[PDB]
Amino acid sequence: QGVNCTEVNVFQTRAGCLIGAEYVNNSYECDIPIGAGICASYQTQSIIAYTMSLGAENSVAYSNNS
Amino acid sequence: IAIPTNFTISVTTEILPVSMTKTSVDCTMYICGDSTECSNLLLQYGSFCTQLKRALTGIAVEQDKNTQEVFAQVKQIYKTPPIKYFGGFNFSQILPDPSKPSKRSPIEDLLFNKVTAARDLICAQKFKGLTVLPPLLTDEMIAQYTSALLAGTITSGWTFGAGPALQIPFPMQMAYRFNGIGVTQNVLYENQKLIANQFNSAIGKIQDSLSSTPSALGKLQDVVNHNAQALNTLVKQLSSKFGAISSVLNDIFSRLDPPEAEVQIDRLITGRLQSLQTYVTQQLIRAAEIRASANLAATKMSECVLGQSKRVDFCGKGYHLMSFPQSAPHGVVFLHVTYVPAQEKNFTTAPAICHDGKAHFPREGVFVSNGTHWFVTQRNFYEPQIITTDNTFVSGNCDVVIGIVNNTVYDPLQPELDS
Amino acid sequence: LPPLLTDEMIAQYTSALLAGTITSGWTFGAGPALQIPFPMQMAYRFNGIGVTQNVLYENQKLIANQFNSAIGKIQDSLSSTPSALGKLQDVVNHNAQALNTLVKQLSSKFGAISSVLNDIFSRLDPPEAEVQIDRLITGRLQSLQTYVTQQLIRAAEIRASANLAATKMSECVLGQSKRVDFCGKGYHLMSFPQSAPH
Amino acid sequence: IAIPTNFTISVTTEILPVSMTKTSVDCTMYICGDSTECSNLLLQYGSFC
């Protein structure tokens, strides 16, 4: 927690440093909360860390007379 | 009786704190730092540091629960259409600003700016074993939730909070809300331009009012000040004797024999443990108060933003029309848009009308008289009309009600019968 | 310490609220005040609860008599049973009891040989006076901290009760409420406030 | 079905506490009393006041 692990896989996050989790670029609902918008999960026989997804995406067809 | 003949649209602001600052404490390094003698003697005192850590962790998770419960109330993320024409209303002052990299709105920025070699106080506090954990949700996520809520309420109305989102033109939504407060929709369809102008002027006035005065956010600053005061007192508690010869302990071990040093060390341990216990208790009480405030804020968000409320003086001052949420450091700000009457006039009324030997009562409105004639008009607005049988119902003769008058009731069928 | 608002000002506020709700209806709580005859206001409220207007206008005298009889009986009902005002008495008794315990806490020896400073000072040497005074100071600080903690908890409870009372005043008096059992037992018609010690 | 034919107007009483007595305390007066040496020793002890 709150330690720059260059003077301690390694990932330097806002909450400190995480060891043992592989960083991905996807987005899922949070399973285990780590902090600062970062969560972790057990997926794929591996442990991954990712950024939260704030639900799905939607747009509503707005117009003058519909 | 008095009847209004004009109206005004008003916008009011409310500020509610939601969350607190998460903290964690290191027992041993706070109590004695790097002395092995304390590292040994503390152990025989049992384990006071399991329940303290448990309570602090409980408070920390409760803060995240509060924030998530208050803000995360939409299943999907809505977006506004690229064109920003909404029948004359100008929502450009609360919608997200695309130019700024922070993707905030022209007010949220004011709120964030309003609330605020050498060593910082945070570093000095951290060097005593008091650490500050970061919140789970970043400010960008909170802004995203707020923008989604604003887009949903602008585009679909209250339908998106009870099922599938259903689009509707904004003018018709405002007409529905006017019908909800008790005023017919022709008033809106005839005064659209004036209402839009008043809305824009009120939004600009809120802009200026928040911009000029810098003491409208007292509650959040008070919470921050209380937390800082508690931490400062805890830090200052380390430089007192607690009934021993000296506060600093290396001198205690160096100067005297181990026997008396044991008594001094025991006194220091007891004092510091007591101080930590009191700090934890005060933190628990403050957390309970913050949770109550967050529950109130969540209820207000559910009841005023996602719908229209008939509770008096709950979502503003006046007849509620709608509301808009904005974020703020450890809190939320509600902008309530409400409706107020103005320019009232005197009139003379009567409970009923005795015509043709029968008593007649109004169906929805009320009876008035401009000195000579008699009309029926809606309660919250002056709109006189000729008394007919379409907007009046009959029951009993006219010798029971007190205060009746005679007049006549026009039947719109006989003229067609004669021609 | 004395309260900021004297009882006269509170009575003035309650009288103003009564006059406003009697002579204006619910309009004075949402903007400019507009007058209206009282029978017409009762007709509006009857329409609000789901009963047509003519029902009141054809039974004005009976309703007035029933209201007068109820207002007569409530005064007698308040003058017999002493358990009706239990809550305020409980608050006062609890505060007085806490203060009494705090003041009585002084006489305790707290493990020492006496509770009077002058006797220890004029009868015992300073080196042992140090530890005796330390014992007494520790005990009295603990007592004061305990008193402060319970005062904080009780203040939080009182604040919650005051918030509920403010909500009831804003919703049942300045307007008519549709919430069930929130402003009485039945279909809500109206409400009137009165002031009591604390 | 069952339908009412008469009504009754009722008045009900509710009591709610609002405020609580305001108190203040003095450190030295409560703890020491009228002895100055106790005050001199106590001022070395802390700032709980």
Ligand SMILES: *[C@@H]1O[C@H](CO)[C@@H](O[C@@H]2O[C@H](CO)[C@@H](O)[C@H](O)[C@H]2NC(C)=O)[C@H](O)[C@H]1NC(C)=O
């Ligand atoms: C809804 O009505 C608005 C108002 O006329 C339309 O916005 C206009 O669009 C045209 C073409 O892009 C512009 O030349 C006008 O300047 C716009 N009006 C204003 C006030 O700026 C909008 O296109 C209409 N949308 C639909 C789907 O009919």
Ligand SMILES: *[C@@H]1O[C@H](CO)[C@@H](O[C@@H]2O[C@H](CO)[C@@H](O)[C@H](O)[C@H]2NC(C)=O)[C@H](O)[C@H]1NC(C)=O
């Ligand atoms: C209700 O109030 C509005 C606002 O004061 C009135 O609109 C004003 O009308 C005058 C013309 O007499 C204009 O000079 C003002 O610029 C208008 N105000 C705004 C904000 O546009 C309106 O006339 C009033 N209604 C009635 C029936 O008197």
Ligand SMILES: *[C@@H]1O[C@H](CO)[C@@H](O[C@@H]2O[C@H](CO)[C@@H](O)[C@H](O)[C@H]2NC(C)=O)[C@H](O)[C@H]1NC(C)=O
């Ligand atoms: C909606 O309101 C905004 C802000 O009040 C208006 O933006 C102004 O645009 C004019 C250009 O004619 C600038 O001179 C002003 O400086 C802008 N305001 C601010 C605060 O910078 C906008 O024109 C209004 N109308 C629409 C359709 O967006």
Ligand SMILES: *[C@@H]1O[C@H](CO)[C@@H](O[C@@H]2O[C@H](CO)[C@@H](O)[C@H](O)[C@H]2NC(C)=O)[C@H](O)[C@H]1NC(C)=O
């Ligand atoms: C009360 O209202 C009625 C109708 O709204 C008024 O009656 C008309 O008044 C105008 C005056 O501008 C006359 O030209 C019409 O001939 C009247 N109509 C009828 C059927 O008589 C009446 O004058 C109003 N009373 C007032 C203003 O004191």
Ligand SMILES: *[C@@H]1O[C@H](CO)[C@@H](O[C@@H]2O[C@H](CO)[C@@H](O)[C@H](O)[C@H]2NC(C)=O)[C@H](O)[C@H]1NC(C)=O
């Ligand atoms: C309304 O009109 C009726 C009839 O024009 C009035 O009833 C008359 O009342 C007088 C005395 O009050 C009697 O002598 C007549 O016999 C009544 N006529 C009828 C046809 O019943 C009634 O008084 C008028 N209303 C008011 C308030 O004066």
Ligand SMILES: *[C@@H]1O[C@H](CO)[C@@H](O[C@@H]2O[C@H](CO)[C@@H](O)[C@H](O)[C@H]2NC(C)=O)[C@H](O)[C@H]1NC(C)=O
């Ligand atoms: C409805 O209830 C009222 C009162 O609860 C009844 O009024 C009573 O009627 C009797 C018989 O006429 C009188 O002796 C009483 O004095 C009345 N009470 C009062 C307070 O005046 C009434 O009869 C009931 N029924 C109807 C149809 O109204």
Ligand SMILES: *[C@@H]1O[C@H](CO)[C@@H](O)[C@H](O)[C@H]1NC(C)=O
């Ligand atoms: C961690 O240390 C490296 C090397 O000194 C530095 O470049 C980096 O900015 C540091 N990060 C933090 C968050 O302190």
Ligand SMILES: *[C@@H]1O[C@H](CO)[C@@H](O)[C@H](O)[C@H]1NC(C)=O
């Ligand atoms: C209505 O009449 C009363 C009677 O004097 C007067 O005081 C009042 O000002 C009148 N209403 C208005 C809106 O002027």
